[PDB]
């Protein structure tokens, strides 16, 4: 490792002589071996870098299952390409196909990891809503009996005598 | 001279990430580097992370637990054990499994329902 | 993790895991010259757990519910959030005030009868 | 995102139950005492 010395005794001064705090960084991070800049793309889409054979419908329960399908009667397809010619050229163009398959599948189906935080932070700040309201007609329940305390000692304030 | 503000803004960053690590604390500790005076005056200067302005560039938790140990000075003519470093460790580690812990019980009582 | 989605992704794993671990134990062993038993009651067993991975596969694919909900709906749900929260707040502090002037007025109220049976001695 | 505001709401968190120190495969103990006015002799004793 390393040991500074530039601004430690820059800091220990007097006056405005310790350095004034950094402006916000509008600009590239460089922050560790990622980037981590400002204003990112939050993820690529399968368009880029990834064949496409499903259209744009995006039946997303049907598009699992047909690839589940597809998948099954390719492997069955892969093995009889390998009973008949397994040492064929054809069979990494089979290899290749079934990994596009298998790219789709699992990019389609996380979705609910920003989804999932947006129910959560709702459901518990109701309960101490409620802990906020449930002290709340606590309140009148307690004022107003001390004020029918008061009324029964002002009431006995004459009856006393 | 924006070089010196961002360059050693990432040196000091990393020093109390460095720091965050026990066994480097352990490495001053038979480097003797506890009790020096300088250092004790750099030490208690280097609190200044708290702030959650300069937090924001601050991504690990411990690097300002320990710190304030080594505050007291009573903390720091310990350590130099490596036994005690590593007691630091493990229960650092045993407390990390927290929200690991508490979400496989939370499932284990919605899958036992 | 730790949902339904998570164990149909063991089972089809397992599934081709058990297929090349039958297709392995059928050609490490079986009958040497017949012109056997253990492998035989390893086949069986290997073609029974290969059917019911593939009997629960079908079993979790009907389980799973279908994609459900919307985050736009969620998002107009926190715009309603925000606007009773900010009103709770006022509604809290303004029986706190009530709260607030009962309070300062009978603590003088015990004060002012406090020092009172102080000076009677 | 879809171009909500940014405005101060109150988010209060979960300090409902709190963790001390862990025992064997999780099973944490829970205890905050939340005394009564029991805590103004304790400060008296050391006096």
Redesign the interface.
């Given at each position: 490792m390393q040991y500074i010395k530039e601004y430690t005794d820059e800091n220990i001064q007097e006056g405005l002589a310790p350095k004034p705090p950094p402006p916000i960084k509008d600009s590239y991070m460089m922050f560790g071996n990622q980037f981590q800049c400002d204003d990112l793309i939050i993820r690529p889409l399968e368009s880029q870098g990834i064949e496409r054979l499903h259209p744009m419908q995006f039946d997303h329960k049907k598009e699992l299952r047909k690839l589940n399908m597809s998948i099954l009667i390719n492997f069955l397809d892969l093995l009889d390409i390998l009973i008949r010619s397994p040492g064929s050229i054809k069979r990494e163009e089979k290899l290749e196909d079934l990994k596009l398959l298998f790219v789709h599948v699992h990019h389609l189906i996380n979705e609910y990891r920003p989804h999932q935080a947006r129910e959560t932070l709702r459901v518990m700040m109701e309960v101490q809503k409620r802990q906020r309201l449930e002290t709340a007609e606590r309140f009148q329940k307690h004022l107003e009996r001390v004020i029918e305390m008061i009324q029964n000692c002002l009431a006995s304030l004459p009856d006393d005598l | 001279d924006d070089a010196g503000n961002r360059l050693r803004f990432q040196l000091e960053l990393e020093f109390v990430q460095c720091l965050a690590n026990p066994n480097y604390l352990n490495f001053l500790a038979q480097r003797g580097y506890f009790k020096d005076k300088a250092f004790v005056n750099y030490l208690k200067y280097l609190l200044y992370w708290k702030d959650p302005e300069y937090a924001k560039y601050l991504k690990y938790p411990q690097c300002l637990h320990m710190l304030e140990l080594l505050q007291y000075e009573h903390f720091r003519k310990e350590l130099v054990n490596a036994q005690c470093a590593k007691f630091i460790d493990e229960q650092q580690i045993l407390h990390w499994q927290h929200y690991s812990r508490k979400r496989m019980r939370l499932q284990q009582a919605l899958a036992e329902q | 993790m730790?949902d339904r989605?998570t164990q149909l992704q063991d089972a089809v794993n397992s599934l081709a895991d058990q297929f090349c671990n039958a297709i392995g134990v059928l050609q490490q062993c079986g009958p040497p010259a017949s012109f056997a038993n253990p492998t035989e009651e390893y086949a069986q067993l290997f073609a029974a757990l290969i059917a019911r991975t593939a009997k629960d596969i079908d079993v979790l694919?009907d389980s799973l519910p279908?994609?459900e909900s919307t985050?736009?709906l969620?998002?107009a749900?926190?715009y309603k959030?925000?606007e009773?929260?900010?009103e709770?707040?006022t509604?809290?502090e303004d029986?706190?005030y009530?709260?607030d002037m009962?309070l300062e007025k009978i603590q003088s109220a015990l004060a002012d009868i406090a020092q009172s049976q102080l000076k009677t001695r | 995102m879809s171009g909500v505001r940014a405005v101060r709401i109150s988010i209060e968190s979960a300090c409902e139950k709190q963790v001390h120190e862990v025992g064997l495969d999780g099973t944490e103990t829970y205890l905050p005492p939340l005394s009564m006015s029991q805590n103004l002799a304790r400060l008296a004793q050391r006096i």
């Open positions: - | - | 730790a989605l694919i279908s994609e985050a736009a969620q998002a749900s926190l959030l925000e009773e929260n900010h709770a707040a509604c809290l029986v706190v009530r709260g009962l | -």
